[PDB]
Amino acid sequence: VYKGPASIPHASAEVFGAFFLATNTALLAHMFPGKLFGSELHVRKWDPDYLASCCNEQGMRREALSGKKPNLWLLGGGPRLVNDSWERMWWNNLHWKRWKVPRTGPAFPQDMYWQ
């Protein structure tokens, strides 16, 4: 009947029950797209590349209408000042762009197969 000193925090059983049911339901919702009352479960609203391309579009359009030469802002970072390779000079933006397909996801199969 003795639980503990009550100065050490106790997590309730409802926290584990919610955790257990939520993990199982998340797995089931990922396996069956189209059956969540006709819908599916996404993990984001907008692609970061899509948002950055829209913001660059509006930024260079506003720069051009103000009478200046427009600038493109690069995800990851700008160039390094080196002289040995093109890939070392532009490494940060190249590193952002090389990660495109796993950033988009998902890492699980997109369609259901019955074994």
Binding site: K69, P70, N83, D84, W86, E87
Partner: protein, 90 residues
């Protein structure tokens, strides 16, 4: 009837930028020539020629590093393995 069965189209993607002769913000499909893309950059009026992005030669250490990544290999290194040399001169 025409000589061509299918139409030949330019198949280049588009991008936006500054024109410097029209002095205008422009959508275009004019990309830099493949005869000098990757060899040089111009981030100032002065020009940087890069020192090692295309490999222009090969020894045994760098061949061992890039053995499965090259599009070709020559007889000059493959003389010294007898099965490879038999593939070159059967």
């Amino acid at each position: 009837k025409s000589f061509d069965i299918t139409s030949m189209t330019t198949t280049l993607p588009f991008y936006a930028g500054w024109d410097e002769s029209l002095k205008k913000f422009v959508v275009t499909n004019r990309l830099l020539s493949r005869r000098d893309a990757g060899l040089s950059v111009n981030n100032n009026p002065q020009e940087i020629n890069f020192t090692n992005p295309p490999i222009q030669g090969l020894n045994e250490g760098s061949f061992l590093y890039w053995q499965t990544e090259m599009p070709f290999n020559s007889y000059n290194i493959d003389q010294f393995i007898t099965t490879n040399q038999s593939f070159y001169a059967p």
